[PDB]
Amino acid sequence: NHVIFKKISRDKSVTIYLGKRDYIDHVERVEPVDGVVLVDPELVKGKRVYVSLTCAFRYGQEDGLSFRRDLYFSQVQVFPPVGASGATTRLQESLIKKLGANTYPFLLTFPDYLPCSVMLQPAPQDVGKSCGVDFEIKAFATHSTDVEEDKIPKKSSVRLLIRKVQHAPRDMGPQPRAEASWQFFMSDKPLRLAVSLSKEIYYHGEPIPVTVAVTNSTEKTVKKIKVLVEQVTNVVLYSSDYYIKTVAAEEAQEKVPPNSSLTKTLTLVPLLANNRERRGIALDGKIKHEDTNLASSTIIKEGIDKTVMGILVSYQIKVKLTVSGLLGELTSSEVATEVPFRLMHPQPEDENFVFEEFARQNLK
């Protein structure tokens, strides 16, 4: 039982069928977009039907318009049939087998230098405007005029906004560890803090066990130990926007008295559903959609300029120590340290077809 997504143009002449709404990027390769286009012969007679894959960065309110920077464009012909227009994939030949003699296959690939689906809409107290990276699979019909000018009617076009989702690679970095120490004003003794995680890559919805070791040699009391998951977002194309937002939070029940040590392990789960406010964070889809999760960690391929990624997303554990009698008397700064990590989806890996609309389901 395989669900297949379809969309018909306004004039009923071109229909797209795709086997997936989200295509998988596991660093090594990127899943190609294979699908089929169903044409009405009488309506595409004398016309040519193409399918294009565009990836673009957008900044501003969409409609003059806003800011757009194209990052990858590819276009393929689907009608009339090109060469031995037999299927390339089992999905394609099964779809042609099911849909009939007017179905033509297409396959558009992703290069190895593109970002994944990332979008953001600012909050009231945020300065920058909404921005994102869109992936558009669009099939359209083209005809000519006796005044030597080709036309592309929107009514003969179908536009799909797919997602390029980031999945974990085969490898994984070293275990993330950090040690920080503070020597506060007028005190000889140091406050020390060691933080470790279990692994370097976590999956969306997987618990993160932050292990914390506070070594308090000072005369002061560590009033509180707070552990956070912070998402850091850098718009690196049109405006140099910057966001730090808290996605998970956990307080320790214990205090660390002067001249003692404490080792605890707190567990956090960074989830979009944790946050009632979905504005101001980096997502992989629109706020209105139930498909939407937090954006995955940006993975920059070696040799590629980070500005071509449009929006950079990173994640870090943050440990905040509230020390008694310090703030307001000995400092106006925070006592905290960071441990970076990466957040993705897990590693990857005749049918009967059920057809559904490509339009993504709203949240409500």
Ligand SMILES: O=P(O)(O)O[C@@H]1[C@H](O)[C@H](O)[C@@H](OP(=O)(O)O)[C@H](OP(=O)(O)O)[C@H]1O
């Ligand atoms: O119909 P058009 O002119 O081609 O453009 C569509 C339109 O902007 C819809 O509002 C949008 O629905 P969403 O709110 O779900 O984004 C859809 O995205 P879609 O590809 O998911 O259908 C777009 O493609």
